[PDB]
Symmetry: D5
Subunit: 186 residues, 10 copies
């Protein structure tokens, strides 16, 4: 997988809150980012997943986390979808269009026989490093509560070097402090 690699440069158009904008890797520097890939606008599982993320978007911004949804549809199409679907209408984050497939291929996430991105989510830290990856099959929707838990764990590890977040970790739970003495003790 791409875990612990740096994201690649990119330049894409996007729809965001009634405007077209250009997003590049420069916009992700010094920020936590979620790249949220999905296969197709006007599809079935895709809107429900996007809406799930939109519900959590206030909480994400409070954590200093930006969201970029990505499909290989155009930004024109995202705009159209945003106004015709009640679910998509509530999205306030950037919807990136990736018709060249370049951004999707940067994340090695193309279904080459379809020209559509797989259901993959990448959590990316302020230095561009991928810290968490989730990929599901066409028929299996993701769950934003799991994303948030991973983001919080990722942020904690970043802010507390010498500590690691064990399984199931939530804020307030105990952490492990790697050391020679701890080796084989757990």
């Amino acid at each position: 997988s791409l875990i612990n690699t740096k994201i690649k440069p990119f330049k894409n158009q996007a729809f965001k809150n009634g405007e077209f904008i250009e997003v590049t890797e420069k916009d992700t520097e010094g920020r936590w980012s979620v790249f949220f890939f999905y296969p197709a606008d006007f599809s079935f599982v895709c809107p429900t997943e996007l809406g799930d993320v939109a519900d959590h978007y206030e909480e994400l911004q409070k954590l200093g986390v930006d969201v970029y949804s990505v499909s290989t549809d155009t930004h024109f199409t995202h705009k159209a979808w945003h106004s015709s679907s009640e679910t998509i209408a509530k999205i306030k984050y950037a919807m990136i269009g990736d018709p060249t497939g370049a951004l999707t291929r940067n994340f090695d996430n193309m279904r080459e026989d379809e020209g559509l991105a797989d259901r993959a989510t990448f959590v990316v830290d302020p230095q561009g490093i991928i810290q968490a990856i989730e990929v599901t099959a066409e028929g299996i929707g993701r769950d934003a509560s799991d994303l948030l838990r991973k983001i919080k764990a990722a942020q904690y590890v970043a802010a507390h070097p010498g500590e690691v977040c064990p399984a199931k970790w939530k804020e307030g739970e105990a952490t492990l402090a790697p050391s020679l003495d701890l080796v084989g003790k757990i």
Copy 2:
């Protein structure tokens, strides 16, 4: 990612319930499988994750799901760990040793500069197809409750073709029925 690809053949030794066994892809045919990679025996986050899975192991077997933990340590070392750690002692599933790294590389999951597998989990259906992927950074433990949700969603989609599991889906929740009419409606 490897989503929607078939697992590759493999042959590895493993520790399971006080015996050494050989596992191959043949043992996964006609079964649901979880391949649970982790970097190192006697490490810190690794045991807590393995223990998390062990807690759920009764529930997994009831779903007809087999678990294979995998590291690049040997099966000798797993056996040693199983008897010295209170957490590992409760593991009843197969602990695979992958010192050649072949099984880990089949899943594209090697940290090449370390000789250790990344924290990756792959859900594999009875036909050998990878249906769900999770990868976390060295410091971020996984959460077995998320795995189980994905397994159940994967099983539902398999058993109900023409239906897909939307975001957040749990047993008893409504599903989507892909069709022309539904396109753009959600």
Copy 3:
């Protein structure tokens, strides 16, 4: 150019009159076909061009000519557009989706830095041979009346070997009959 070459096999999904269908080269065998490429659903010149062809579609059908519009957008997106645009709403021909870009590249017609097709029109005879090609810049709309003229000239020449259609030819006008005697006399 691709003039006087045979079209390549293809297989694509399309939206046509409230249905999703599959189109392949077999659909075109024994028929006159127009492959009408455009860059983007929900864009600006594209709808006006497509509406213009729709205005001529009754006549095209009478002449045994099928129309396939093609963009790299999906057939889902074509369905959405067809319902939200009153121009696109009048289209009764197949709207092919080409998100893999394979059909577009068959016709050497991809804008590689955009992942969108150029404004190209190809007239294909029942033997799969390209008899006329028109390509215009992003800002320059095509004119279906000129397309109809070329289709009629191509059909005439197929039905009257030994005759060719001079500049500006329309039905009922003098043709040229190639021969040694005519050489250098015009």
Copy 4:
């Protein structure tokens, strides 16, 4: 196609209004140019097409447009044809000879089995960029009226960056102004 690409350097001899001259890409710089390819002097469709362009030549010169006709015949042969054909006698634009085929291959327009150019027309702007292409089969004459409409649209979009010309557009008719708000409305 070669749409939106820059023309290649060339150096060819030509006949123009009773004398032999050299033509190069430098002569096209800062001018609109039409490269009008045809297969063979003394043939049948070819003279009618060239004459049709000659009929429009005064109008073209008024638009700042130079015409270069091109075949793989020599400039000597063009001069002879210009003397013996009443149609060709009317030509006041440069008739380029391309016996090496290099100019023709620059425009990817050679019938390799014949050593003759296909019936292709390229509209080229002052910066050398190809803005419109037309190619027709051996038996299908072109129509200069369509050429002029395309040239005019090309000049209009060049002179009005923020506007595009919809289908059928001619002088005085409504243009489109691409914008976010116009996305999906036509």
Copy 5:
């Protein structure tokens, strides 16, 4: 040079006495042939050389010698030339058009930077072997009576093995009979 090599297969259109014909290497089999190459129809040089061959053509035909003039111009252009020039009008042999350059290149006689053939003449026997070659720069006339002399010599040696024709040989002159005793004797 190509002396004593066999001519290569070819298929070209020609103008011959008011008709268009196809010439291939099969037409040369069992015959003596002259391939008379020249650079360009309608050029500014008087075509005295072609005329000189025409003057001698009745005699060449009595000797069973076919003549093929060749340039890279088309057979259409040869027909027009034959109508326009009193000298060329004398030609009753085949005027081959070679716009692909393939026949010219078979004889390694292309000026690649001009797309025109050099001034070369090849004498070819009934088995397709080249028995004499002459190439000259412009203004250096190929004399048809020297061609005839060389043809008669070539026919004589073909009919009299064991004899060779010394310098200046013409019918009625002594020949040489290669032998050991003749070695060093002349």
Copy 6:
């Protein structure tokens, strides 16, 4: 063919009027030259051709034209031949030996399965450019009167470019 190309550098030994000399492309500069190839000393057609050129050599020299005969035999062998044949004894031009075949291959004129040059004649102008080429089969001797005619035409067009008779 090699028409309108520049001759290539070369360096060969030759026999000329009872001496051995070295000939190079520098000897040809500023002069008209005939390179007269033939297959073999002591052979049959070859002497009669060489003798024919010798008959015309005074005339050629008055036209400022040098002659170089060339075969793949050695200059030693040319000397021997010049002594033993009445025909070859008349030759006053240089007889170039080309045993490596390099001069012959410069003119793309080797019979590779024989190691002998073909019967080829090249007329080369003072700038080194090949202006006329004639090649005949093993059995067919050349005619120096045609060579002279061509040389004179070549000199004429060099002196008076584009005085080629117009087309009507």
Copy 7:
């Protein structure tokens, strides 16, 4: 074999006397070193061999000889083994972990189908040159007494150039002094 070649740079983690340290080739420069490879922690022959070297370690240290044991197991695993085995417990030298296999492959000593090192011992002088090599089959334990003999012979030869140690040589015994006179006399 690698005899009389220089060791390659390396960088590995090791367990040594309750600490994790880094070992590189720089640690070996200016020292005698024994690189003692074995296939697997918690295995059978490996502990007995390592204990045997430990029995000799006081003497090795007195002679200026360092020992590095190496397997492809991790340094974490070495720590665990050192605490659970009373044999391994007596080891005071560095136990190198080589999970990437790089150190093992430097010495061309990998069992590629197992990902474990072969039973190989390399004696390395202060200039990095390999002076003695022993390799035994999986089931065949080495004998440290023979290793000590070879180390002493190597040290002797380094300290007494012009002398060599004959078969079976131990300290205090006759050496050979190579010379022309000695040639063929033994």
Copy 8:
């Protein structure tokens, strides 16, 4: 190393007990073999090593072990050495000459700068498999006592599949029986 690999085919001349013979790999089949390489006849360490092996030769023959000494000198030179050296005179095993170096290169044992073999000993089982290797520097003589211990251990493990020989093992001493229960206990 070459440990656990099969020896390669060879064909060499040898001196043995007063006659010249051919030796091939076929002669080693079904026998234990020692290939005893050394750099040069008439040298210094070499004779003492060969004599040491000769001292053990009766014991080796009793164990069904054949010895082949090998240098890049010829069989002629071995015969001469066997006559003029009191040490070499004692040799009753085959002395192989390898002037092509092929046998030496089979065992990857050539000093390429010298054209002489290194001091390497290979123990080879009846199936052709190399079970023990020893290589020493130019100045360091080997010790046949260690050779015999290794041969005996090799024969023991061959004859007792389920047992391995620990460090220091000699006849009569405790072996190890690999098992799961023995993992980690030593």
Copy 9:
């Protein structure tokens, strides 16, 4: 060197006793052969060497040994030389012409910058195997008495293998 290798197939024209003949490797089968290369007809050392071999040719023929001299000159040239030189006129063995250089290159004996063969002699046994080789510089003539001695030794060891005097 080519020692102990089998000669390669070849086909050349030769002059022999007033006739032109074809020589191939088939002519050498079952016979002892000497291939005697030299650089150039009409030259200096070459005739004296060839004349020396001719002096010994009757003796060679009594030993069942054929001689083939070879240069890159033609067989026409050998005939001329055989007529004009008193030394060469004595030669009754075949004089092979090798203008393509193929026979010379079979014996790896070409001076590539000259197109002439080096002064090499090869003794070839009835099975085609090269048993002795001698090569000398341009300036150094060979000695047929040494050649005869070697041929006789070669015949002796062929007839009586391993009767080489023992080492003490």
Copy 10:
């Protein structure tokens, strides 16, 4: 052959009059040299040829000719041979050992399937050019008086440019002076 080529650099050990020395190409510079190759020391052939050269060595030294015998055996083996054979004991010139085969291959004189040199002798002048070569099969003696004759001839031509030595030449015999008049005269 290598006639008239320059010898290549080399560095070999030799036995010369009771000592070991190094010989390189620098030792040959400014000197006449004989490289006398032979297959094997201690072989069953009497070394009469080497003895014959020894017999003539005083004379060769007066002529400033150094002799180097060469085989692929070592200089150790040459020393032993020189002690064991009454014939070889007469040798006071350098006996080069060439176990790498490099000197032998410089002279293209290796029997690759034996690892032994062929029976070749090379005469080399002070500028390193090979002036005479002799190669014979076994039993065909190289005669030292023929070598001397060839050396004296080579020295004579070196001292008298413009003269060459005819067949059978010895001091006092006439030489030839290459000239034009001498061509064809002998």
